[PDB]
């Protein structure tokens, strides 16, 4: 062949933290179909928003938005349990079909994005060199989102484990733990990675008895 059809830019979706998660990498030959399974961010979440992105930046907002759609009717469940399979399918004609399917209900929604959508050749070149000019700032952004997500995991899981502990937890411990979750929740709203890390560390330092109870509960 003298020619190939390739994706000039990565394609994916926005996930928690405002990050672009890639489903089809830059320079993949088409046709191609890739899938990954995602889940919900909150307890009792009834819907997910699939925000489709084109580009090479780690921040969703710095990539080109190809569309969005919602999948509703997710049944009540703890965060992280539902399985929402997202498939990106680019056919021989260069048309992108994005679908999200809830594997519990079998419910599905799609967006179709015609071959002409997204960034033109001048923006494509601008995008590739911006991703390169910014590899460092994007890395620091990725590390901050990762920290924030781990802190949100620690916040939520520790709250669930305080509740399952009930009176097994000594009152001194619960006071220390609860003041530290308040401090973590507050830090999570900011942009200071070391402050988040500091509040996570304080929670680990005051939660050793809680950790022991929760381990024993399922041991």
């Amino acid at each position: 062949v003298l020619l190939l059809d390739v994706t000039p830019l990565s394609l994916g979706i926005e996930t928690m933290g405002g990050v672009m998660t890639t489903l089809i990498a830059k320079n993949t030959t088409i046709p191609t179909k890739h899938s990954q399974v995602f889940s919900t961010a909150e307890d009792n979440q009834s819907a997910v928003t699939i925000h489709v992105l084109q580009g090479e930046r780690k921040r969703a907002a710095d990539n080109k938005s190809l569309g969005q759609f919602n999948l509703d009717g997710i049944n009540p469940a703890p965060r992280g349990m539902p399985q929402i399979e997202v498939t990106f399918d680019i056919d021989a004609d260069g048309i992108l079909h994005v679908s999200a399917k809830d594997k519990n209900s079998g419910k599905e929604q799609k967006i179709t994005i015609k071959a002409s959508s997204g960034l033109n050749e001048d923006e494509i070149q601008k995008m590739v060199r911006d991703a390169e000019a910014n590899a460092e700032a994007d890395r620091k952004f990725e590390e901050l989102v990762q920290t924030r997500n781990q802190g949100d995991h620690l916040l939520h899981s520790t709250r669930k484990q305080v509740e399952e502990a009930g009176d097994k937890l000594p009152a001194d411990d619960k006071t220390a733990i609860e003041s530290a979750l308040t401090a973590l929740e507050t830090a999570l709203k900011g942009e200071d990675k070391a402050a988040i890390e500091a509040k996570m560390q304080e929670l680990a330092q005051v939660s050793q008895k809680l950790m022991e109870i929760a381990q024993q509960q399922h041991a």
Binding site: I13, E14, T15, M16, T21, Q36, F38, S39, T40, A41, E42, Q45, A47, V48, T49, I50, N70, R79, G80, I84, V86, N149
Partner: peptide, 5 residues
Amino acid sequence: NRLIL
């Protein structure tokens, strides 16, 4: 409405 990995 966010998704996680």
